[PDB]
Amino acid sequence: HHHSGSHMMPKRSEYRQGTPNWVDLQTTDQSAAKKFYTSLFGWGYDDNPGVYSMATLNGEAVAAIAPMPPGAMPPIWNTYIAVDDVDAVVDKVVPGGGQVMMPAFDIGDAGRMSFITDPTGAAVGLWQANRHIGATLVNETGTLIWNELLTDKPDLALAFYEAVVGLTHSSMYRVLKAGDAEVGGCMEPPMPGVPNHWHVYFAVDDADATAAKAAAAGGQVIAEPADIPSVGRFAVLSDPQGAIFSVLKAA
């Protein structure tokens, strides 16, 4: 890991524990990644001292792009889940059958985080906010719309998130809940050779158009645009550096 009123706009100023709160990209070429994600999503950036490049859209923080640490590596989109007391949560990880990959530490005055794996090996950050809460805009076009745990052992994984952050779920595909709020999903991965991981979806107006634009911008279409019944339409894409993520047009 690199750190080593119902109709209102979906602004966020707070995250309940268990809610995915943030995604960031660690990459081999920050400059190039910036241009690519601008091409797809229209992001601007605020560089903060390497440099952590905060992606912005309509005056709101939506994600970030970070440089790699030493060692080697394929670029990756990281997911973070909000927690009230990261130290307390971390204390439950090993008893719950997971691993603490990166022990808890303070990131400037942004917050405090740990990087863990669940018992199925899917990695996720635990984020205790100080100055930085996470995304201040979600769901809208160009922003984070869904976080999905792709794992070959959903119930085992989800028992762990219940024990450690209090996430519950219901089946319909598993929809994850932090209290009464739906905050993400979980299912078995699409193909052999896909590691268990937290998958990142950004909202788009037209999955097909975005997929075409991705290829034209030097990325790759990993899974061509396809419909998910009653949900909408998605494509799985790679940026030109190799980082995989999906785009979703919701119906």
Ligand X SMILES: OC[C@@H](O)[C@H](O)[C@@H](O)CO
Binding positions for ligand X, rule: CB under 6 A: 12, 19, 138-139, 146, 181, 183
Give me the least distance between CB of 237 and Cl ion, in Å please. 8
Strand extents, DSSP E, 83-194: 99-107, 111-117, 123-129, 144-150, 168-171, 174-178, 181-187
Read off the tokens for 119: 């018992």
Q: Which does 28 bind (CB under 5 to 8 A by kind): Cl ion, ligand X, none?
A: none
Contact of residue 31 among Cl ion, ligand X, none (CB under 5-8 Å per partner type):
Cl ion
Q: Which does 215 bind (CB under 5 to 8 A by kind): ligand X, Cl ion, none?
A: Cl ion
**111: Cα separation from own chain's centroid:** 17
Q: Encode 220-247: b = buried (16+ Cβ within 10 Å), e = exposed.
A: eeeeebeeeeeeebbbbbbbbbebbbbb
Minimum distance from residue 183 beta carbon to ligand X (Å): 5
* Window 186 to 225, contacts with Cl ion (CB under 5 A): 215, 220-221
CA 240 remoteness from chain centre: 19
Which of ligand X, Cl ion, none does residue 141 bind (CB under 5 to 8 Å by kind)? none
The least CB distance from residue 147 to ligand X, in Å, is 6
- Closest CB 51 distance from Cl ion, rounded Å: 15
- Whether residue 248 contacts residue 202, with contact meaning beta carbons closer than 8 Å, is answered with yes
